[model samples]
Target: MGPGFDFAQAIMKKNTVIARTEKGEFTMLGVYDRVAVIPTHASVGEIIYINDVETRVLDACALRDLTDTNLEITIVKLDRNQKFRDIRHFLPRCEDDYNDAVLSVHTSKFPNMYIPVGQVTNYGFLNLGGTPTHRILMYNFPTRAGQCGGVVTTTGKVIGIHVGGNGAQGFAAMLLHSYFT
Candidate 1:
């Protein structure tokens, strides 16, 4: 952590944007402290309204399986007129080299209401298209179907991005070196 890097502060600085696609409006973690990681499924070359401003999707990448149900990690680049803060420093590598405590940011059914705190209960992998992809299990975190592209962090360090979740547990695509590096 740095001089002004508080977990609670970071959460407050989060800019939860609405991703408008052909499907519908999806709640996305636009800029958390300055980091932007979008879900592949939610990003169909659609317009992402950030802070009521229309932003362009400069670039995107599929980290693992191309299917929406797999790792489905997508990095979104926004064309900005003004320079923003650098959040890359807070992004942690997705390897199994950190502490167990994990936190996530998710949106509720109520518009503009987001849960900025949650826990990562466990970690594991799933076979997708005959390839194994790393995933993290979250406990006591509730996320809606369209709100699957938020950021997950631990101690102010980004661990991964949320992919999907059930009633009690959620899943996120870890920042694996094998896939990202």
Candidate 2:
């Protein structure tokens, strides 16, 4: 019921955190400037190679049962040179409690193949509660170090902030999703 923060501006800032990929590799790229789009209301996609391409949601929401918690997220966007700086003091804080939690389905698939074939890992009640659960997930898969405060969204609504991913191996996140329904 309070004033909602602007997801676009907060996420797309001068130095928003981004996941790092292997150099000279076919790292997943966004063809559109904005990845967040409200379906059935406004239609938009990513811009790849200066071309607008219809993009699919990185992670399907329906497949994952979503939950909100009372956890606030702090995004520390700084440069390596400022390692000694208290960059956390200058970071932005999401005014929510508890981190976002979800049951994720992971599978391994062949290159350029749409389907995955593998046993799914169901993280059931895996103690996804507490401050550590408040994650800042990265946008790219197989997240490397230095990637934090990535954008998180659900149903076209801002939910959590990305911290990093494990290059299709794993992922980490910080909750920006509302815990209160």
Candidate 3:
């Protein structure tokens, strides 16, 4: 470890890359190697931009094994020739379950930054039409549009990826060894 090298909330700022596409812009987490995780909606852009670099997508797969809902995320793989840093905080800790975990919400709005700590209230419902799907975690963390795909963490471990939410309410995709297994 170099001087001042740590995972004390700064990884949310450094390890995260602002993904810009033809459609919209969102945040992405640098997990390991050349792979980055982001919400699936912003993954369809033909002209992709990793921050400001035009990095073409090598593999963009939707993590859909969770359910028909799939929690709606994509594992994006890119081959940038330059040096890159992978986040070493991919350890999964979904043993005890949610509703008790207060996670540090990490999202880079680029123009502005806010990392608010939010608590998982309970198992939220992914309301599809009228059916309720108990496959989502509800947090009381207010989030914005560009804040999607941010990292949620607690206890020095990656909790989940911040999906989306409204004022004083947020949703997270729980961190798992197998996101789509």
Candidate 4:
């Protein structure tokens, strides 16, 4: 089932958070530390709000620079020393032998949450992170634009950040192996 984690403090850590951007409310993917990688298309300087707390994008340029790993994603840096959530183990660069165990956790509120339980359909080579090593994930489910930025997780860790959907099929970028530094 791929490599799991110590999972010592999951109850205290988070994988996704509610975010408000220029477009609308979206699910912000928490990765690394003090940063969020969103699936929504964006650029630098765009103002965003994390769980209603406003902020701006520190860097969102590489998503297009083909020379810089076709990340086609957005990297939103939070306030200094401020972390929206913490992601320890990244989705593996290999198959985990578990499919239906996947989940897309998106924008949530008070108690009502927006989490979609799905399954990993395929493991393909998409150069979103430069070299093809298990970079793209396609799933059997539906996700809205706002939900595009949702954090896809299995075993309570990150698998992929959901992109906008088309009917029953959806795509996501398996980031975090080297998306941030």
Candidate 4 per-residue lDDT, tens place, 1-181, comes to 2322223124214656677665566666667566767654543356667777776666554454334445446776776446644454554644343354344444543222334445675555554323433345777776545556665666545666666455767677666455554
List where candidate 2 sits over 4 angstroms from the true fold.
Answer: 1-72, 75-140, 170-181
How well is each residue in 1-181 modelled by candidate 3, as lDDT tens digits? 2212234256556667778776577767777767777766565544478878888788887765445555566777777775446445455635334433433333244443545454564464675224343446677666666666666655556666666676767777665655523
What lDDT score is found at residue 134 in candidate 1?
54
Candidate 3, superposed: residue stretches over 4 Å from native: 1-8, 66-68, 82-89, 93-112, 121-124, 128-134
Misplaced by over 4 Å in model 4 are: 1-13, 42-44, 64-69, 84-86, 93-98, 108-118, 123-134
**Root-mean-square deviation of every model:** 5.3, 16.0, 4.7, 5.6
lDDT for model 4? 0.55
Model 4 TM-score (2 dp): 0.68
TM-score of 1: 0.65
Between the candidate structures 2 and 4, which one is better when assessed by lDDT? 4
TM-score of 3: 0.74
**Model-by-model lDDT, in order?**
0.54, 0.25, 0.60, 0.55
The residue pairs in collision within model 1 are 94-175
* Candidates by lDDT, descending order: 3, 4, 1, 2
Q: Lowest summed-lDDT stretch of 10 residues in model 1?
A: 1-10
Ranking by TM-score: 3, 4, 1, 2
Clashes of each: 1, 34, 0, 0
TM-score of each: 0.65, 0.26, 0.74, 0.68
lDDT of 1 by residue, 1-181 (tens): 3322355246435444555555555545444233355665665574566555677767666565444345666666666565445455555544454444343333334353334444455576754335455565454566566556655655666666667666666667675434432
